């Protein structure tokens, strides 16, 4: 299947409480493998997955230097955006950055990303062609004009199509036992009487990896969305994921309903029916 590597940076200003908080995490697919926290004691990039711990001191030194450089630039970015938006020094504000790359089942480059948000809304984002920018508003046009005149996108194209792909491949190989595994969901259905009139059917998918999954209800073989509820896919805490979907049905008609489970670890989609 396809894979991705992504880094997520969160920078939060703390007026009167010293330097801004800075947190960086790195993911391969749905597995976190590194973190950095400006408030932690070590002041180093740290491992968060077993397979990355085999990297030697030059790796950790290099990643620590780069993540501190990212932190220094975000410190200034907060002050820069406060000016663009004519905001006071009194309030707390949040800058987010995400970048990384997707590859196909042949592990060749598919898509690259490099984008920013300010206080929860888009600020600027590299477009899919890796040559141009989407400025979310008038303030972000300033950044876009600067980045265009400096050909910033061309240097990022090289990282997203080169280093990012190459090291995603290296991680996928070094972590093959866990990153290349496909844990199919374990499934079951529960039934609860809400009254003497209607019943809730709940279709469960447990201990699956990766997170991507589709649970759908059908009645008489036709897709059914009315009277259904679907929760967000959620982490089990052991590296796997969980999800459920429910439908409320008239009592005596449970046998008309089927839950359908699609996941990359299934050789064929599953169809569950009550009892």
């Amino acid at each position: 299947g396809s894979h991705s590597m992504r880094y997520f940076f969160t920078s939060v200003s703390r007026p009167g409480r010293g330097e801004p908080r800075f947190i960086a995490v790195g993911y391969v697919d749905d597995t976190q493998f590194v973190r950095f926290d400006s408030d932690a004691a070590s002041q180093r990039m740290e491992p968060r997955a077993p397979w990355i711990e085999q990297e030697g001191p030059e790796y950790w030194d290099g990643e620590t230097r780069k993540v501190k450089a990212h932190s220094q630039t975000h410190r200034v970015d907060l002050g820069t955006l406060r000016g663009y938006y004519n905001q006071s020094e009194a309030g707390s504000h949040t800058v987010q950055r995400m970048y990384g790359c997707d590859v196909g089942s042949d592990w060749r480059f598919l898509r690259g990303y490099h984008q920013y948000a300010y206080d929860g809304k888009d600020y600027i984002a590299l477009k899919e062609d890796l040559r141009s920018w989407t400025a979310a508003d008038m303030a972000a046009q300033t950044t876009k004009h600067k980045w265009e005149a400096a050909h910033v996108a061309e240097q990022l194209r090289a990282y997203l199509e080169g280093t990012c792909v190459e090291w995603l491949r290296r991680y996928l190989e070094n972590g093959k036992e866990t990153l290349q595994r496909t844990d199919a969901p374990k499934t079951h259905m529960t039934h609860h009487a809400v009254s003497d009139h209607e019943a809730t059917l709940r279709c469960w998918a447990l201990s699956f990896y990766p997170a991507e999954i589709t649970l759908t209800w059908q009645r008489d073989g036709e897709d059914q969305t009315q009277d259904t509820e679907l929760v967000e896919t959620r982490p089990a805490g052991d590296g796997t994921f969980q999800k459920w979907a429910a439908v409320v049905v008239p009592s005596g008609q449970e046998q008309r309903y089927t839950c359908h489970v699609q996941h990359e670890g299934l050789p064929k989609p599953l169809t569950l029916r009550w009892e």
Binding site: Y7, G26, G62, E63, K66, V67, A69, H70, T73, V76, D77, T80, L81, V95, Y99, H114, Y116, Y123, I124, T143, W147, V152, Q155, L156, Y159, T163, C164, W167
Partner: peptide, 9 residues
């Protein structure tokens, strides 16, 4: 691996 590119808003 992180990028080393200098990017400032």
């Amino acid at each position: 691996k992180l990028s080393h590119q200098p990017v400032l808003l």
